[PDB]
Symmetry: C3
Subunit: 36 residues, 3 copies
């Protein structure tokens, strides 16, 4: 169905946004090690 698709996409957008944050968090910890 069409609606199931809309929900899969919506959950993917969330997953993606949570991944961008995780990456920013990781980069921050990596930068701490790399400079200090």
């Amino acid at each position: 169905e069409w609606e199931a698709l809309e929900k899969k996409l919506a959950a993917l957008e969330s997953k993606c946004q949570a991944l961008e944050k995780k990456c920013q968090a990781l980069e921050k910890k990596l930068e701490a090690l790399e400079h200090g």
Copy 2:
């Protein structure tokens, strides 16, 4: 077409899941450096 969309979404869900694992793998290596 509708079916092409369904396939693009399915491949995106896989890509996303592989990215969550990569991030978990990275965080693990980062935590090793950060504590030991």
Copy 3:
């Protein structure tokens, strides 16, 4: 609408591709710390 969906998916595919690169970039910096 159908077209709005197509655009959301297209922007998600980009976001995902940019995340794979970020992860590769991070892993590269992490590997530098881990071996050198």
